[PDB]
Design a protein around this nucleic acid. Sequence first.
RNA 1: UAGCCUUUAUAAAUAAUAAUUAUUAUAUAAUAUAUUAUAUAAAGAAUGGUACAGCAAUUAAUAUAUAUUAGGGAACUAGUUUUUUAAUAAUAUUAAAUCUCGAAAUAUUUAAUUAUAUAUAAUAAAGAGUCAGAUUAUGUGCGAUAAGGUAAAUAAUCUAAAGGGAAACAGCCCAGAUUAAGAUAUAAAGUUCCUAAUAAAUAAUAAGUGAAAUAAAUAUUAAAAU
RNA 2: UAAUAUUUAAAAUCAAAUAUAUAUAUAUUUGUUAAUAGAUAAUAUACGGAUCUUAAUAAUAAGAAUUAUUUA
RNA 3: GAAAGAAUUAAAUUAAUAUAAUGGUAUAACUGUGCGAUAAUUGUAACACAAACGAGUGAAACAAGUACGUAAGUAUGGCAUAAUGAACAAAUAACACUGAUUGUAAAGGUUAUUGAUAACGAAUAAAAGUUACGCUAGGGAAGGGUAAUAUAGCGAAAGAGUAGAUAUUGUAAGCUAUGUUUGCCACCUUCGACUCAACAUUUCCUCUUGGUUGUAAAAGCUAAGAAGGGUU
RNA 4: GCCCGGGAGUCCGGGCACCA
Lengths: 115, 194, 195, 118
Amino acid sequence: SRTSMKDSAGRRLGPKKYEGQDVSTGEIIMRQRGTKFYPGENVGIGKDHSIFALEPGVVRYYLDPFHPKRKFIGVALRRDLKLPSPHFEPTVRRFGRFELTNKRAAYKEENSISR
Amino acid sequence: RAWSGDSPYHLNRPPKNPRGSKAQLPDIHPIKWSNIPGLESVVINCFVREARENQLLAITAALQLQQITGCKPHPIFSKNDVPTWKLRKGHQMGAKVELKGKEMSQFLSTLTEIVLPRIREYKGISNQSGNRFGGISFGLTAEDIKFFPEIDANQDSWPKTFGMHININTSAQLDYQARTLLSGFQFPFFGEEK
Amino acid sequence: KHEYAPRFKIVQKKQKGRVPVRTGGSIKGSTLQFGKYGLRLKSEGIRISAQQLKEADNAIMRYVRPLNNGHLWRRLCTNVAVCIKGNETRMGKGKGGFDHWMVRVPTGKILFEINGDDLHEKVAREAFRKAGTKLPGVYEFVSLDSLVRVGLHSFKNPKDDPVKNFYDENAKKPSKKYLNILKSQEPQYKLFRGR
Amino acid sequence: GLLWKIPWRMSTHQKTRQRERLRNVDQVIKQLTLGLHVQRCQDKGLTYQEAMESKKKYKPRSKSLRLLNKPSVFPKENQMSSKDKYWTFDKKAVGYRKGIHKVPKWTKISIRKAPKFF
RNA sequence: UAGCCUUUAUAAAUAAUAAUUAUUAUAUAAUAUAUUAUAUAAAGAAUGGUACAGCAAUUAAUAUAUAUUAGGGAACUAGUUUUUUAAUAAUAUUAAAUCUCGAAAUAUUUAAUUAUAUAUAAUAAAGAGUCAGAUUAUGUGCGAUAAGGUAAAUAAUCUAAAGGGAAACAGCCCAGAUUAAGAUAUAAAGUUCCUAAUAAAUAAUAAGUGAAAUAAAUAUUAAAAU
RNA sequence: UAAUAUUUAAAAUCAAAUAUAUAUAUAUUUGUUAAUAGAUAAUAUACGGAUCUUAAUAAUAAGAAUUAUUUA
RNA sequence: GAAAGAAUUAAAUUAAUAUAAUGGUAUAACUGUGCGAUAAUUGUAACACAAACGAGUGAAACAAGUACGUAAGUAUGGCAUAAUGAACAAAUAACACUGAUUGUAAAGGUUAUUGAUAACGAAUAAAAGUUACGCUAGGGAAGGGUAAUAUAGCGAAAGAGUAGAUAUUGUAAGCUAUGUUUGCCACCUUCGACUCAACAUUUCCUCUUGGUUGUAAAAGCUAAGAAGGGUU
RNA sequence: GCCCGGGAGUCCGGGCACCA
Ligand SMILES: [Mg+2]
Ligand SMILES: [Mg+2]
Ligand SMILES: [Mg+2]
Ligand SMILES: [Mg+2]
Ligand SMILES: [Mg+2]
Ligand SMILES: [Mg+2]
Ligand SMILES: [Mg+2]
Ligand SMILES: [Mg+2]
Ligand SMILES: [Mg+2]
Ligand SMILES: [Mg+2]
Ligand SMILES: [Mg+2]
Ligand SMILES: [Mg+2]
Ligand SMILES: [Mg+2]
Ligand SMILES: [Mg+2]
Ligand SMILES: [Mg+2]
Ligand SMILES: [Mg+2]
Ligand SMILES: [Mg+2]
Ligand SMILES: [Mg+2]
Ligand SMILES: [Mg+2]
Ligand SMILES: [Mg+2]
Ligand SMILES: [Mg+2]
Ligand SMILES: [Mg+2]
Ligand SMILES: [Mg+2]
Ligand SMILES: [Mg+2]
């Protein structure tokens, strides 16, 4: 091989969703090699160490006192509140299921059970 | 050593390794009532080198060790590879026994009352043999092992015998203290000048 | 013994790069930390090749040899390998073969300095002038009490500078990471981490 | 090759023009600041004339404007040196300097602070 | 095929573009050592590792009547001293495409607000052309810090852009021609004549240096400063 | 004040100016050489050309068309 | 005041990671061990990243079963990023889907799997040369630039020169000029002889001159002015 | 992949399909 001339393409990894941005459950937030960012509140981590939203909400980047020397990406459930959330204050959950008003639907639901 | 903060690069920098060496060293505390030198543990390692060829030799060595001490040894495997000597990793070679408490005391007594005396030309342990944090070591040839009670009683049973190293760990802060302590237990240090 | 031929293990080719024009006012390698009299670059930064350096060195040496307890030390080393294509060959077909070693020299850097109780400063100056002739820039003689070249028409004294303690500064105006660390160190967090 | 007949110096007229341009830029900034101040005054509860009069004029808060106001970062024309009105720092010139008039759109571009020693 | 262009249109449509607020600290005032309001300073929400800066770790370079480890040579009666040889340690100094512990600006970029609505985005139904570009400036790779060279990156112009300037001029500097008209502002450029338009001030130059394309080391002569 | 050996600097220093409490202090900003030689090829001198450097005695009168810093 | 325990702090890091390099990793992904060989299972996969399409990547959730775990939970192979190949035509199984007059079948389809086109979006199952006897359509899909080399000149001076760098010489390194050589670039598509020469000066001769322990003279050497005439 | 030649196993050489 007199000349070299081989190389791979860029991988397009990096942040795909920025502080303040509204994610939806599933949306990929960060692509990375290794964990330069760690999953925080309401955030999952896939096989690539890709961070993604577990819930609808607002993306925030933070430093967690419990974990010094680690950067966190998380989803705050609503905009107003900060994300490295007070340790002892009750955890803000979503619930986020709707109730079957339509009577037939409700009946069906009632009927259906595990196998 | 911590970094002088005369530049901004020092800020989140790991400290400088010790002026003398790579490794960090302990503080020498003064010898008071609370921390007098004492015998901590005796480790015996018999690395039979001829066991590179014959693996039964290792077993025999281990048995010998057991006989000498009265507590189960543990096998010593060859941790490295080297062509010059016929050495390949993953090869059982010799036995290592950790002696503590009463057992270790017993062993030491046996060494001092019987063996070290009986060995023909022994001029005592070398004074340079200090670990430097209060550890002392010395060898025994393949011949001297015959002088132990458990072996001497049946020479018919032990055709091959294997030499060994003996390491003695002490609660001593420094080597000289340790050697003084050892002398108390009848260890001749006439081997050299410190 | 080998400032002109540094022994890197992996002999690897190197992109041409550019000679730094130290804009933040470096002052690094611009003072004479040993020796009495020195030889500094006066002009724009230049790439000095090993051969040139050697020739300069040899020129200087003849002046020093006579002196009792007189010696010359070389401040810069030719660390950058240069590959040159054969003249006859055309463009393409990759990079050329390793030719020689060079060193990028910023504007105010000291190439050499000397000392030797016996030596008269005039002689030293002369020597340095002679050395200069072998090198591809314009050079200036420096003494132990001559102010440092920062730019190419600008000087400074290193003794007049802000002696800061940077830890203190950091504490005063802290980064986020540091703050986080401090918080972590604080009692409750330490207690409740449960690792 | 192809003859781009552009001189290494500037004519006096050109220099004057440059100076004027510089002054104008400064003036714009000043005007902006003034406007901001009077807005602030009005918010507080004053008339236009009163605001104009006021001794304690308010500095601007927005970062950019503040930076512009600082003479360390963005000099005014009278403050500025001759060597910086008609030359820029070129990293690859002889003398590390180059006439501003060589800079692509120098009539629009602003560029005051050359490096400290270069 | 996507990208860039066009036509017609759609709307529980402002999503588009631009900036601002967002942070930290200080001072003052008011309430409960905290919170709010006002002022001021700070390259000021979040993302980042280039310049610069640095030599920490990694990779390299230098210097020791310094320390240790052995060797060579040497003196007196194996011990010893000196002269060192190499290595390691110590202290000082240095640099790098594939080192960054410090670290810009520009940049990516978020919600709300304000400004752009004769405006932008999105979507739907239809159409295309284009896929040998060029130069300038900036930061690069290749070349020899050669090329009106070559390869990509960013911005502009040219391509497809007439007008004024750059003597003449694709790509430079200004400026975008619907049609006139020619009074007033002017842009870049100029103002002795050619050639539209000029008067001053302070210095320096005596070479026609120079007057729109700056030729180097160095030498001589003078001038200032210490 | 003569001779003497470097340097061609506003970093330091001094002077001046602006912003902050203000007759001071703090912070920022600006102010530091010139000639000559070196110098050079082929149709023709080649700033585009003419040409431009000033002077008493005298002009209701010219005084750089160069370089640097400016004004109207 | 001691012993033991729980630790905590510092250092953590280039050790180790199936495998290159990078990023990560002690809160361990790294190592040891118990159980387990089960998530190296089965239907729907929203939504993102990426992206011309074909493809690729992460993945919440719903349902079926399994493993470990006191539980919380965790597992849809491997710490991450490589480890790959379209359709067509064949082949093997399952499906109960059509069955060309009806019934069977054949054949096709659905689902699952198999072998390659490395010129790796693969023209065919199957393919090398030569033409200076050639032909057609087209495209250009010495000069100009550069000065590495060459020639020429300067600055400094190692060294020659019976002595002494600078009469004369002048290593390697420095700074330039020329576009007379060998190249490079791709804006652009014949060497000699004869005849006649024109122009230049970096002057071979002739004219003037400076230096020359190396100008006694004569011959020279070297340098300055000089292109009028001449130069087989 | 299947079949040979030199009970099982290894090590070698022939064919026979596959060759889209
Ligand atoms: Mg890559
Ligand atoms: Mg650097
Ligand atoms: Mg032109
Ligand atoms: Mg198209
Ligand atoms: Mg880089
Ligand atoms: Mg094409
Ligand atoms: Mg080109
Ligand atoms: Mg065209
Ligand atoms: Mg035009
Ligand atoms: Mg346009
Ligand atoms: Mg128009
Ligand atoms: Mg002239
Ligand atoms: Mg000119
Ligand atoms: Mg001419
Ligand atoms: Mg002109
Ligand atoms: Mg690693
Ligand atoms: Mg694992
Ligand atoms: Mg797609
Ligand atoms: Mg093929
Ligand atoms: Mg193909
Ligand atoms: Mg073929
Ligand atoms: Mg040609
Ligand atoms: Mg040519
Ligand atoms: Mg001549």
